[PDB]
Amino acid sequence: DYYHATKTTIFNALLNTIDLSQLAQLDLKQAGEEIRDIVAELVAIKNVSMSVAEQEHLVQDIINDVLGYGPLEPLLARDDIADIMVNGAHRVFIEVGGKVQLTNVRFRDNLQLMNICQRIVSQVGRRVDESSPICDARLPDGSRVNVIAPPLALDGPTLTIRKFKKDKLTMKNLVEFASISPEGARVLGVIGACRCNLVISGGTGSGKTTLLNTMTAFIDPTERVVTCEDAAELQLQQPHVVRLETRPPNLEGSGAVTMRDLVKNCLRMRPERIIVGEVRGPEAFDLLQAMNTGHDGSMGTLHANSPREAISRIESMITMGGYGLPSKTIKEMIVGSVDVIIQAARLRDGSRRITHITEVVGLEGDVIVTQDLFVYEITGEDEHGKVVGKHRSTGIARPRFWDRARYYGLERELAEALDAAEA
Amino acid sequence: DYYHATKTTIFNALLNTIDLSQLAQLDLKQAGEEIRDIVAELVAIKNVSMSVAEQEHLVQDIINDVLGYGPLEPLLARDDIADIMVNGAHRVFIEVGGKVQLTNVRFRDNLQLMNICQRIVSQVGRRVDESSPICDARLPDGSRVNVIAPPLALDGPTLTIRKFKKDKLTMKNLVEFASISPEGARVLGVIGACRCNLVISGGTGSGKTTLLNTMTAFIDPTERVVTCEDAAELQLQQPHVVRLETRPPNLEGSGAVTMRDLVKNCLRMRPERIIVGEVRGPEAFDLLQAMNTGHDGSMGTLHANSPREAISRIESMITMGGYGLPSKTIKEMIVGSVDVIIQAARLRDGSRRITHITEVVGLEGDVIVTQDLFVYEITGEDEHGKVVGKHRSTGIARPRFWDRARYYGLERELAEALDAAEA
Amino acid sequence: EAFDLLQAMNTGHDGSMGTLHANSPREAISRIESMITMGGYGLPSKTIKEMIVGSVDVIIQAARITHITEVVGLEGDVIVTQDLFVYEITGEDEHGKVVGKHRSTGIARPRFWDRARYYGLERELAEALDAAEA
Ligand SMILES: Nc1ncnc2c1ncn2[C@@H]1O[C@H](COP(=O)(O)OP(=O)(O)NP(=O)(O)O)[C@@H](O)[C@H]1O
Ligand SMILES: Nc1ncnc2c1ncn2[C@@H]1O[C@H](COP(=O)(O)OP(=O)(O)O)[C@@H](O)[C@H]1O
Ligand SMILES: [Mg+2]
C-alpha cells in the first residue's frame, strides 16, 4: 500500500506544478530536471517514508509515467519476453519460453490504456480512436503492434505486441534435432549454392519458414537478393538484401499493395534471385516467370501436404488469376520452372521431419512425373511412444541437376555425398 | 575529414542568410553567384582550414545541396557505370564490367534520399509518396528509374537507376547473336514491307522495343507513319514519319493526354500506318479499330508471356472499355485485324530469343484457332550451361496471310521461306 | 465471411467453432460452398470443397442432436462423410411423443484419433465410444 500510496499522493504535486497540457514547453530535456526538482520539493513539503534511493526510483517512475510508456517500460526491455498482451487495465499477460503466464501489473484505468495505445502507435503515423477502431502497424524497433477500440471490444480496448525473434535454428541444430539426416544436410548445402529453384511445401506449422531461412544462408555474398514477405520473419547474413513487405487495405479497399504487385515490381529492380514469403494468391504465376526469365535461384513456400498436391495447388493458384490459360501450357511452364520441391511435415508426436526432397522429371503425356532423392519412412513407435523412422536414397546416382554442380564447382562434394548415401 | 563540420556550418550560415524558402528568386545563375559569394564570405569569417581548392569544392557541395540531386550528382556522370543501386541510405552499389561492387559513397539521412528520389521522378511529372510508394519511370535522357518508398520497403527508400548504352541493334546483329536464323527469319524481312498487322509480345527486359525498331526500318520512305510513344524511344531514319508523346496529369491533376487521346486523333490525320509504342489499357481497342478500318500495317507492343495469354490480355484490355461485345466477336476482330503475333522472351539463362512467329487464322465459336507457323523448342543445356534450343518451321506453304499478301507478289518469298526450311 | 473463419481453422488456429442453419450434412456443406462463392473470390467449387474438408472435422447436426458426423475426404463432387452417432425413429407413443433411439454408429477410430492420442485421451474414447456399442 505504501509503495503505491506514496506515488499516488506525490503525483498530484507534479501534475499541479506543471500540467501535462504544458507539453512541448520544458520538454524532455528540461522536463527531466523539472521532475527531479519537483519530486524533491514534494518529498520535503509532504512527509515521505521512501529513502533517497527510493526518491530517485520514484523520480524515474514519474518520468516513465509522464514521458515514458509507464507500466510497459520494464517489459519492453527484457529480452526473454516475446509477446506482451494486455486485454485490459489490470489483467496483463506475457509469453516467456513458449508458455503464457499472467503478471502482477496494473494500469490506472481504461483512459490510460487509450493514452498509452495512442502514444505508442503514433510513432509510425497511425491513429486509432472511436472513429477508427482498428490499428495494426510495424514499429521502427522491429515489432508488431495491434490495437482494438471500445465500440467493438465489449470488455474494452485491447492491445497486442510482438517481437522479432533473433535466435533461429541453424542447419546444425536441425541436424541435432534429427529432422534431416547429415547426408540430407550435405545435399541441401549443395542445392543452396547450386542455384536450383526450390519450392518448399508442408502443412501448417511444419517448419517451412525456418527451413527457408536455413537454406538462404548458402547464397554467395555477391548477389542481390530481394525478399517479398508479409510478416518480415526472415533475416539474412548477406551484405546485400532488399527487404520488402506488402500492405493490407487500411480503409474500405483503398491503398492495397498485394504481394503480386511487389513480385511484379521486383522484376525491374534487376534482382539476382527473388525469395517469396508465402505464395497464396495469383502471385505464383509471376513468381514462376521470375523462375523462368533468368533469375535461377528463387525460392518460395506454399501450403500443401505432398509434392503432388503442391503442384496441384500451384496450378490452382495460377488458374485463380483468370488469365484464360490452357492447362497443358501451365503444366509445361511448371515443369520448366520448378527444379526442386522440399516437403516438410509434422507427425503425431509433435516432431518435424523432411519427408521428401523431390525433383521434377518432366511431363509425359498429360501427367507430371517426379523422382526422389530422400524419403522418410516410418517403421513404428519406441517404448515411450515417439515416432520412429529413417531416410534413404532411391539409387539415383547423378541427380537431374548434376551438370549444375559441375558448372559451379560443387561436383566433388555432391558426388561424395551421394556415393556416401550407400551407408 | 574535418570538412564535414565546416561544410555543415557553412550550409547553416547560407540557409540562414540565403534560405531555400526564397524559391522563385535567385534563379540558377543567380543562385550560383549568391552561393559562391556567401561561401567565400563564410570562409573568410567562418573558421575553415580548407584551402582555396577545398573552398571551391565546398562551394560546389553547397550548389549541389541547394539545386542538385544530392550526393548522387557525381555518381550519374561517370564513364562506364552501367547500373547504380541504392539499397537504403548507406549501401549504394554500382555495376562495372558486368559485375556489381560496393561504393564508399553514402548519404546523410533517409529523408534526404526520399527527397532526392521524389525530385528525380519529378522530371517526368510523376509523384512517389506514402499513398503511392512504387514509381517506375523513363527519364528523358534515356535512363530507367525505379523507386520504392518506406511504407513498403523496410530499410529505407530503395532506388535503381539503370542506364542504357549506345544505339540499338540492326537485324544483322540479331542474326549474329543467334536470336533467329535467316532460314526461319526471312518472314521478318518479308513483313518489313508486306504491310500486314503485327503485335509484338514479351516480358520485361525481353527486347520488344528493339525488335520493333529493327522490324520497322524496312518500311519504305513513301509511306506516312505516325508513331505514338509514352516517351521517346524509337529512332526510325525514314524521311516521312510523325512522332508524338503523351502528357501525364499536371500539378492540379488535369491536362492528361493518354494514348487513346492520341490514337483517336491520329485516326483523322490520314496516316498510312500507326506504330504504337506500348499498349497499356483502353487504347488497344482504338488501335484494333485502326487496323480494321483501312489503316492496315500497324504495330503495337503489349505485355504477355504466351500468345494465348497475349490474346486474353488484349480481350481484358478491351473489356476495360465497357462496350458489351462477346469474347468471340473481339477474337474475330483480332483475327481480321491481327495477322502476326510474335513472341519475345528470355530463357532460363537470360539471352534474348524469339520463341514464336505465330499467325491467327479464325474462330470456331468462343475458341480461337491459331496456326503456329513457327515455334521454338529447347533440348537442354550446353557444356558451359547456357541453354540450347532450335527454331523449326512447322510447315505451311500457304498460310492464312497468303491471300492477304498476294498483291505485292510476295507469295514467292513466302513459299521460299516456308518450303526451303520445311526440314 | 466464413472464409476467414475457415482460414483460421486451417492456418494454425486449431479449435474453431461455427454455427449455421442447414438441415443435413450435405446441406451444410452446400451452404458453406454457396457462402464461400458469394464472396466474389471466384474459387472453383472443387477447391472450395477441398477447403471445406480441410477446415471441417466434426458436425454436430442438431436438426435433438440427431447426427454427429465427420468428413473422410473427397473424390470429386462427392464429399465422403461417415457418421459417429445417428438418431433413428421407431414409432410413436400414446401421448404423441416421437419414440426413437440414439445409436453410436459403431466405428471406433473417428477422424480425430490422432489428436486424442496426442492430448492423452484415447483411453476415454475407448471407455466411452467402444463401450457404447456393447
Ligand atoms: N525441426 C524443428 N525442430 C524443432 N523445432 C522446430 C523445427 N522446425 C521448426 N521448429 C520450430 O517452429 C518454429 C518456427 O516457425 P515455423 O514452425 O516454421 O512457422 P511457419 O512454418 O512459418 N508457420 P505458417 O507459415 O503459419 O504455417 C519455432 O518455434 C522453431 O523452434
Ligand atoms: N538479340 C538481342 N541480344 C542482346 N540484347 C538484346 C537483344 N534484343 C534486345 N536486346 C536488349 O533489349 C533492350 C531493349 O529493351 P526492351 O526490353 O525492349 O524495353 P522494354 O522493357 O520496354 O521491353 C536493349 O538494351 C537491348 O540490348
Ligand atoms: Mg519498351
Author numbering:
A (entry chain A), B (entry chain F): 80 to 502
C (entry chain B): 362 to 424, 432 to 502
Text taken from the publication that reported this structure:
After incubation with the non-hydrolysable ATP analogue AMPPNP and in the presence of Mg2+, the sample was vitrified using holey grids and a data set collected for high resolution structure determination. Subsequent data processing yielded a map constituting six subunits arranged in a C2 symmetric ring. Side chain detail was sufficient to build amino acid residues 150–502 relating to the N-terminal domain 2 (NTD2) and C-terminal domain (CTD) for each subunit at 3.8 Å resolution overall. Henceforth, this CpaF structure obtained in the presence of AMPPNP is termed CpaFAMPPNP. Although CpaF was incubated with AMPPNP, this nucleotide was symmetrically bound in only two of the nucleotide-binding pockets within the hexamer. ADP coordinated to a Mg2+ ion (ADP/Mg2+) was symmetrically bound in the neighbouring subunit, with ADP alone in the remaining pair. The ADP is likely derived from AMPPNP hydrolysis given non-hydrolysable ATP analogues are not entirely resistant to hydrolysis. Comparison of the three subunits in the asymmetric unit showed that whilst the AMPPNP and ADP bound chains were relatively similar with RMSD Cα = 1.2 Å, the ADP/Mg2+ chain underwent a significant conformational change where the CTD rotated ~34˚ around Hinge 2. This induced the CTD to swing upwards 18 Å relative to the NTD2 resulting in a clamp-like effect around the nucleotide binding pocket. Importantly, these conformations showcase the key stages in the nucleotide hydrolysis cycle including ATP loading (open state), ATP hydrolysis to ADP with the exit of the γ-phosphate from the active site (closed state), and ADP bound with low affinity primed for release (open’ state).
